[PDB]
Design a protein around this ligand. Sequence first.
Ligand code: AGS
Ligand code: MG
Length: 386
Amino acid sequence: TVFYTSIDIGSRYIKGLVLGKRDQEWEALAFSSVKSRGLDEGEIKDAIAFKESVNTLLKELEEQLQKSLRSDFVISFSSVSFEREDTVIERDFGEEKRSITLDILSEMQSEALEKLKENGKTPLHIFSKRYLLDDERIVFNPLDMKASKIAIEYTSIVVPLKVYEMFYNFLQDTVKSPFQLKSSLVSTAEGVLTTPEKDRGVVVVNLGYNFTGLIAYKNGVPIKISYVPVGMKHVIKDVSAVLDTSFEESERLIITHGNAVYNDLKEEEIQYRGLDGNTIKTTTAKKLSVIIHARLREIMSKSKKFFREVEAKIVEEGEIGIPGGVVLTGGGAKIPRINELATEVFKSPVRTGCYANSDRPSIINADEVANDPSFAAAFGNVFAVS
Ligand SMILES: Nc1ncnc2c1ncn2[C@@H]1O[C@H](COP(=O)(O)OP(=O)(O)OP(O)(O)=S)[C@@H](O)[C@H]1O
Ligand SMILES: [Mg+2]
């Protein structure tokens, strides 16, 4: 039995999941979400507040287990500074043929790591985009083959070295166990997509708090990664501005009553407190949905630029359109009727992403969070890119 603690560090919530694996079998042992403190705009802005928020989650998880289990950690975070980088590493053995070994592959991959580091970048995910043996044949796994020459093109999802170091050092400090750091957006895609979507082409739109993350898959791997710098935080701010209420009351209103489609709504009255925390004010669910709307149309319209960019890259491989359409994830994916709005914008199939609707293995007792789009990355963290 191996145990994993997966943590997905968002700028509004930190989510955690403890899993156990035996043979082919997985079970969920604990899960929770806490308020995030000290992160903003993809950066730790208050390390002491960050540490305490993380600690608060670990304490919940341990109360659920009732046992002080050892596990290995996998921890993901979001950032607008994720980028895709391509690196080629070549080994020429001259005249003789030799067996390609785990040693040779491990060394070539170390080399690609150093080449990205020399360029001030650290990969959170690295995989091979192509193996080429003797300048003439493409293989998918070169292990035990014979070649005089091997070239490997790696695709990496990287962040700046200094971003990596800050997270690594604070986390090591807090988590007192071996850990690996990952991209929340890559792990979201791994937690929610099916294998035929990842192979034939699909776009994940992550409706997060500080910004909307965008990632596209083809041939089983990420082919493009980007963002729109407008997220649920701006929707919250719009409501707080029109109603004159606190950030917290505006988010409560959105989560409680928000709808992405307003044009058929009744004028149901809803109540909230003004900034003095005391006066009761009144609006309608329709009116709240009118605010929400404009900003969500904005986010989906700017994400459509990325969708069309991908659609061009995918059509070059002989696909018609992006066959998988759009999968919506993150907190904003829980707004009622968001898929209806996204379908009007994208003119494409749109579904909600969650671990339950991927084709990943059933996890015993995981249902409550397997069905939650904001837990996708927490699951995806325990799986790797093809
Ligand atoms: N049921 C809900 N209905 C509507 N909105 C919700 C719901 N639950 C959460 N949200 C919204 O989603 C925002 C949080 O989104 P999440 O994706 O969980 O944030 P995050 O994971 O902390 O963000 P990232 O990944 O750092 S940019 C919240 O502020 C709410 O506005
Ligand atoms: Mg997130």
